[PDB]
Symmetry: C2
Subunit: 1011 residues, 2 copies
């Protein structure tokens, strides 16, 4: 039969799901979580062969190794070994939508391994094999004999091999199918790969075994008393001498223990479970678990005899915590949580979707290091090790079932179909059966983007019945259906409603008070970090903090799903949709992370970190008020550093330790600060530093900061009188001003400064001209698919209006000789099809000091789309190594994403003034700059700017960052005003009104000089 084309058959001869087992045969080894000789890893080099379809697989393969097969490493995704192309499609299914059928051309991966077992495993006991991850379906053979079949690429499939094992060499044969009916439930926006991408192992258990166990913790009103209730289930022959003992450990101390024979209480007219027993342990003043302080206990479950003989032991870490929704609030150990989360896929630039401990630890450290306290398993059960790390490092987790049918029409066609309830149910139930003992998991999720069907309600209720300890949520069908305890929309904006029919996305503040609504609101997804994004991020946090029931959300998302390819020379580059011949494909939509595929941060990460700080500050006079947003921990590893500076010049500082309790305040009085009479603005910058290193951070780690303007003393002194006076030389074609060894040349035909000289060295490679456009950011383009011409998108509106093709018509270009300077006045009008888009009026004043004062006043037609920017740009001949400036920095910041930037004197290498977004666009800008220094140049004013070796044009025409070439000289963009980058989503205009350049008339001035 073709079991991969029948949702009625999701497995064959597969063992029941259960919590992580190791079948320890020694209680001390179990308590310390040390290795168990009964659990073996079969990871390593396997024999692999690729085929176009399962029909092409030679039967001989079942009996012996095919000489054509290659020796590859397992786990792995065969697209990563180059056997075929990984595919990046977002919504549209990778295969023709015709359930339950799949294409006859079904890439088949044939894996095989020769191995042998310990003599004792042949004598007695149950030997089972475990495949943590097989994408997407597979058949299994042992020593030529068929064992079973399994589906669901994200949960373990186990099979009893006891009756197939033989002395000597044994051979596993695994036929993996890329496509199956299960693929209809795995349409997540990500790379479509396949193979055995997760661990493979052998577990040896006794015939009379622990087949399952559940750990629960209930508390009293103040959590000073708890009861640990453990239900243990067994398989095999029941016998009166059998006992179960559950002991609770805190380090090497046993705080509580419980022993009892099998035989549960009576549950109905036929009695109770003779094969189960529930132990109840009293725990006084338990140490509570939270992301803040991940206190953990160790629970050891022993199946032994009444007279002391251990049969086998299983165990897990225990975190005493209560998760409950009360009066509209999500409470953890009685406190309202504020979710600082992120959605994280299991992605690796080299290994594809194969995860490893090192990578997970790296993600967790970066996350906590950037003030995240939660993560969503978008959109499937993760690698088993992820939960252990979260339990221990401290991260709230949303465990999500591997069910996504985004590409269906309507989205709920399958999920509302009773005939898919079985397949759907196993993806939900097997997840809960596997992860329910993990304390880090505080919320169960029924999946992602599958509309809202009756199957969702059925499964919602099942969980509620089986595990009342955790709330259940699901966004599909409107984010507030009868299948979710939490209003969990994706991309709902703060103040703006999006009244979509049927599934509107109300402003989150409004959503809360809709007639009858009482549930808490936590976005399952928000702040789409695709490329230069996260504009308006602070708006979300201001709302989260002011509204009790707005309890945060999970950013989308953690890491760019870009893959690594190599060119002719063997140099690596970041590839995305379509770069593998995969088509249809959705281009760069697979990259929406706060970090690059190699975990290098994007500028946006700093903004998230800043807005997600755990300490709030207020300033009044000499007093700084520090408020703690921690719910449980006291600030026992923090000291406040404060420094006052005048225009970047340090003037005073000092440190004060932080002794603030959760939700508490601390008043800090700053001493008398010297009185600077020197013109300038005084700035106060404070930062919280962690003097001691921790499991997730180094000593000196900065966890928060904030800036304030103190006193400002305006300059009322005039500059030194000009000894000399510049001379003007006229020509029909040019206006030349000369002073000392400096020369300025204004082209009378274009009306632009076309050249400058310091001695005989040219300064410009391209004239200084106005600029009202920018290389479109992913948010300006707006498309979740590589096949959509959207006229509503900003980039499209700018093209239709001719912003990118507007030619500068000169209206006026005059020159006047003044008492101590030359005044050049110009006026241009950018038009397109007889329509004047903008009008620019300027005056250039050059005095005897050699300083060029540029005054600019622009007019923007009210009926033309608001411009991307209002400023000037040119290509300097110069190419220096440093960029020194007095403004917001040191990292890239934009109008609607600069709260994390600080005002000060920054000095960086030129390359750092460039942000390597895989998909090139406007980047590296820095706002609130009062002074910019490059080479012999200095510009003064109050402007925004970016500077690099790439022109706006090149960035605009280049698809991949690796294809960018450094242009001659340096490109400079000085903006008086720049449009917001937005980010609420990346497929519709998202730049908030206050950040759109719509004033109609703009003014800004600059001073250009040398030295």
């Amino acid at each position: 039969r073709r079991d991969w084309e029948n949702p009625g058959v999701t497995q064959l001869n597969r063992l029941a799901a259960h919590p992580p087992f190791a079948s320890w045969r020694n209680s001390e080894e179990a308590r310390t979580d040390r290795p168990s000789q009964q659990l073996r890893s079969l990871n390593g080099e396997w024999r692999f062969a690729w085929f176009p379809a399962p029909e092409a697989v030679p039967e001989s393969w079942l009996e012996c190794d095919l000489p054509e097969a290659d020796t590859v490493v397992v786990p792995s995704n065969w697209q990563m070994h180059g056997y075929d192309a990984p595919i990046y499609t977002n919504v549209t299914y990778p295969i023709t939508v015709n359930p339950p059928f799949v294409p006859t051309e079904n890439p088949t991966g044939c894996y095989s391994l020769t191995f042998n077992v310990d003599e004792s495993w042949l004598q007695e006991g149950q030997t089972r094999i475990i495949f943590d991850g097989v994408n997407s379906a597979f058949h299994l053979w042992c020593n030529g004999r068929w064992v079973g079949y399994g589906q669901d690429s994200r949960l373990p499939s186990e099979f009893d091999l006891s009756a197939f094992l033989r002395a000597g060499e044994n051979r596993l044969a695994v036929m993996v199918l890329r496509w199956s009916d299960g693929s209809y439930l795995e349409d997540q926006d990500m790379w479509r790969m396949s193979g055995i991408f997760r661990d493979v192992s052998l577990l040896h258990k006794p015939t009379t075994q622990i087949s399952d166990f559940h750990v629960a913790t209930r508390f009293n009103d103040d959590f000073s008393r708890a009861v640990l209730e453990a239900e243990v289930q067994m398989c095999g022959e029941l016998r009166d001498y059998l006992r179960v003992t559950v002991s609770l450990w805190q380090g090497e101390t046993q705080v509580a223990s419980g022993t009892a024979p099998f035989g549960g209480e009576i549950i109905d007219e036929r009695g109770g479970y003779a094969d189960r027993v529930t132990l109840r342990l009293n725990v006084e003043n338990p140490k509570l678990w939270s992301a803040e302080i991940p206190n953990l206990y160790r629970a050891v479950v022993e199946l032994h005899t009444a007279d002391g003989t251990l049969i086998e032991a299983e165990a897990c870490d225990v975190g005493f915590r209560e998760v409950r929704i009360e009066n509209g609030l999500l409470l953890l150990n009685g406190k309202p949580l504020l979710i600082r989360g992120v959605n994280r896929h299991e992605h690796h630039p080299l290994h594809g979707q194969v995860m490893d401990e090192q990578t997970m630890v790296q993600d967790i450290l970066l996350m906590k290091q950037n003030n995240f306290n939660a993560v969503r398993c978008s959109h499937y059960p993760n690698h088993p090790l992820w939960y252990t790390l979260c339990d221990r490092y401290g991260l709230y987790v949303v465990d999500e079932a591997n069910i996504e049918t985004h590409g269906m029409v309507p989205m709920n066609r399958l999920t509302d179909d009773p005939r898919w309830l079985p397949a759907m149910s196993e993806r939900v139930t097997r997840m809960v059966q596997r992860d329910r003992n993990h304390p880090s998991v505080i919320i169960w999720s029924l999946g992602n983007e599958s509309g809202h069907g009756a199957n969702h309600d059925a499964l919602y209720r099942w969980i509620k019945s089986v595990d009342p300890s955790r709330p259940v949520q699901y966004e599909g069908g409107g984010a507030d259906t009868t299948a979710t305890d939490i209003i969990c929309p994706m991309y709902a904006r703060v103040d703006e409603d999006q009244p979509f029919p049927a599934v509107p996305k109300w402003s989150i503040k409004k959503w809360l008070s809709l007639p009858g609504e009482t549930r808490p609101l936590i976005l399952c997804e928000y702040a789409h970090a695709m490329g230069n994004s996260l504009g308006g991020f602070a708006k979300y946090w201001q709302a989260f903090r002011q509204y009790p029931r707005l309890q945060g959300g999970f950013v989308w998302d953690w890491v760019d799903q870009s893959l690594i390819k190599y060119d002719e020379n063997g140099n690596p580059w970041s590839a995305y949709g379509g770069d593998f011949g995969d088509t249809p494909n959705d281009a760069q939509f697979c990259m929406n992370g706060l970090v690059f595929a190699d975990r290098t941060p994007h500028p946006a990460l700093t903004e998230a970190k800043h807005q997600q700080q755990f300490f709030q500050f207020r300033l009044s006079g000499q007093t700084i008020e520090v408020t703690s947003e921690y719910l449980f921990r006291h600030s026992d590893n923090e000291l406040l550093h404060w420094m006052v500076a005048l225009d970047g010049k340090p003037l005073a500082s000092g440190e004060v330790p932080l002794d603030v309790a959760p939700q508490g305040k601390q008043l800090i009085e700053l001493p008398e600060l010297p009185q600077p009479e020197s013109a300038g603005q005084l700035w106060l910058t404070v930062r919280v530093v962690q003097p001691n290193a921790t499991a997730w951070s180094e000593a000196g780690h900065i966890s928060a900061w904030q800036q304030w303007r103190l006193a400002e003393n305006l300059s009322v002194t005039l500059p030194a009188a000009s000894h000399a006076i510049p001379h003007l030389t006229t020509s029909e074609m040019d206006f030349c001003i000369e002073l000392g060894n400096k020369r300025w040349q204004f082209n009378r035909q274009s009306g632009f400064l076309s050249q400058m000289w310091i001695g005989d060295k040219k300064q410009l490679l391209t004239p200084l001209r106005d600029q009202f456009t920018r290389a479109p950011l992913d948010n300006d383009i707006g498309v979740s698919e590589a096949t959509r011409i959207d006229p509503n998108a900003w980039v499209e509106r700018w093209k239709a209006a001719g912003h990118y093709q507007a030619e500068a018509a000169l209206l006026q270009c005059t020159a006047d000789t003044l008492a101590d300077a030359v005044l050049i006045t110009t006026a241009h009008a950018w038009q397109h099809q007889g329509k004047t888009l903008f009008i620019s009026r300027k005056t250039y004043r050059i005095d005897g000091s050699g300083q060029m004062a540029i005054t600019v006043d622009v007019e923007v037609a009210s009926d033309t789309p608001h411009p991307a920017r209002i400023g000037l740009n040119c290509q300097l001949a110069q190419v220096a190594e440093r960029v020194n400036w007095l403004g917001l920095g040191p990292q890239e910041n934009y109008p609607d994403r600069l709260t994390a930037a600080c005002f000060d004197r920054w000095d960086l290498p030129l390359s750092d003034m460039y942000t390597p977004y895989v998909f090139p666009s406007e980047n590296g800008l820095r706002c609130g700059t009062r002074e910019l220094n490059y080479g012999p140049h200095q510009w003064r004013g109050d402007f925004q700017f970016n500077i690099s070796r790439y022109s706006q044009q090149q960035l605009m025409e280049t698809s991949h960052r690796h294809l960018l070439h450094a242009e001659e000289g340096t490109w400079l963009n000085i903006d008086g005003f720049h449009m917001g980058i937005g980010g609420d989503d990346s497929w519709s205009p998202s730049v908030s009104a206050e950040f759109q350049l719509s004033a109609g008339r703009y003014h800004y001035q600059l001073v250009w000089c040398q030295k």
Copy 2:
């Protein structure tokens, strides 16, 4: 693969479930529900071959018929043809509890059929086959080619045969397995049969078709306006020219009609169902549907081109009614229901589990004629025609999923197992998709006796989601779990609690008000009608009428599940558990009905009819108050017949028209009644008569009655003085009294009247002795499983105390000659192992009138189990044809079951005084009798009695009624007192206290004379 041993595989290539289809190609035919040429019946003579296992089936069977095969009628269960034996087991599974495995020796039934198909059917469209019922799993082949597989013995399985058929002759091959994993979900307390026991048919549908349609009716606050919403789904070629027209008909009048193109409203981000359409029709002052008045409309669903081409039409009967639970009450069209229901199994004594129209109509007419208005489909979806009849005749239906795992341990082992969820959901989901359009179905049931598992919660929620028009109920796990909207216990008693651990059965009155409880309570099972039962029935109805939230229940059950067998003389007799060599079995527990398998009424039926009357009466002086319990109808077919009688002698009578509004009252003043001077008790008897015939009753049908004692005149006149005086003759052995032609002989050794003579003929075959025991009724024995002795059972307490073997010891026997009579005085003590159980003191007075007054005074030890009865018995030499008595009658009646009986002068043939209960026991009693006439004898007093040709001993020793043999003469049992029969359940003592003979001392008198 052995799919019949895999709960993961419940079907292969089966079509989706849907409501009844006929695929008319003419709307008028659809409207009239006339036969459809596109719907053929394949019922008739098939070829059948029996095998001991599927592996024994020869391959040649697929290609052609087998020589040894026989020609049988289908549908049918092969056990009814004698191929193997039917098994009657209650709780214990008929197979070894080892899921999902069945015995390797699994009886296999090979059915085959060579049928014809017109090429017209193959020229276009889809040709499918439909099996309405295959027990319990099967594989299907058409023309030697494999088609599919299916499970669930109670719901239709459909397969597309389009590509397997050919013009002309075709052959089907159906391999039916008796056992499968599905059997673990079909452990209902009934006969375990198998085969194709329901209709088989062939349906033709065009390629573009109506694949499903839902009809719903919502109303305004007063039901004066309504909206009919019909959602229609299509399959095939979806084009813009497609339309659906739903028209509503009331007879030949089209009341409403709607037409629209396909394309449902937007439901989610991907759009909506382009293959669906919802029609909404307004209906003013709709005629409401109810069991009282089954008003129906006809809905025709036309799939057609916009231009007028009918592709095909489907249809159904529509009942406009709302079913909702509000404030604790179950409401039908806004009024609280009083469920007068009964559980009914699909059983036939000759055909087993095969249902036919005639039988169904017979059950329905009998049920309504006996004031039943509801029925529970215990415990599986019923034959499709059942719902049509209930819709049309008017009966509230509880549709129940085919799920019972009673035999598991604990009962919820499979239902709480997520691995059995798939199999369970299909039994529930496919039931709803098939019957959701029938108005008679008002409640969905999740199954029966399967404990309460998480799977129950998920499916409960599923129904609430797909169909919010009907409450969902389920008794498992305690009758009040989170999986039921109605508290629906089985056998919960009216006042007495039964605090069982985990799943107690509280007194229904108490259950309603337990802290926090608010739901209505309707017993899914109560008043176990096993054998001589229904004692205490009136107690349930008094409560139902007094407590608003006690809304009735379903009696258990309708018809005895006895099967017909024949003796060597070819005569038929009723058989039960074990009568077919079936072992283990539960003998007679399969017979618990109000009627025999041939639908002959048990005496209990009348008690049910009486207590379930729709008119209540109250008497005050000469005014009779009638109160209607009807919720929607006026008494437009009822008249009141009243009659007054003096000890059976009718004095006055008359008719009065009944004009009562629903829930209304009517006062009727009786005319000046006569005032007879003659001694006696005046009795008033009123009967509600239906003058006109109905679809369910004949003219003259009596639907209710009631009696009252009016004025009484105690006889104070002395009997004429006797001329003569009896002569006494003494001897050591006897006391012989003589008067005229009458003689009496009292044995001086036994102390009993050993013989009498009328004229000169003997009158006794056995002496007149005391009796304190009775042939145990099913309720005295109690053992739902013949493999469970029980000391607590009444029969066991009586035996242990020696009630059945105690011998009378003479304490005294004297004779005295009075002035006008002879007085015999006796005393007896019944003992057992030195214990005195009872003491009987009597006096026999024989005067000159030839009469014999017997005075009896009994003492019963307080520490001996209360006696079954306290009276006298003897074997009359006479065998008369008639029995005439003044007292309760005419049918059998006992202390706790005599409310239906009426006091009057009854006269019946001897045979009617015996109730042919299949399992013999005490029977035919009649209480409140003041006079009994049999042959030349007459007995006067105030007693209870039974009279027949069978001795309590024979009844007690015989297992089947056909084994009973008339004894010489007639056995007479005259009781001063008789214990109640009980019936609340048949497996534990249920006779209420007030009906137990515990007074310690009893007195009664009788006068024997020759009339």
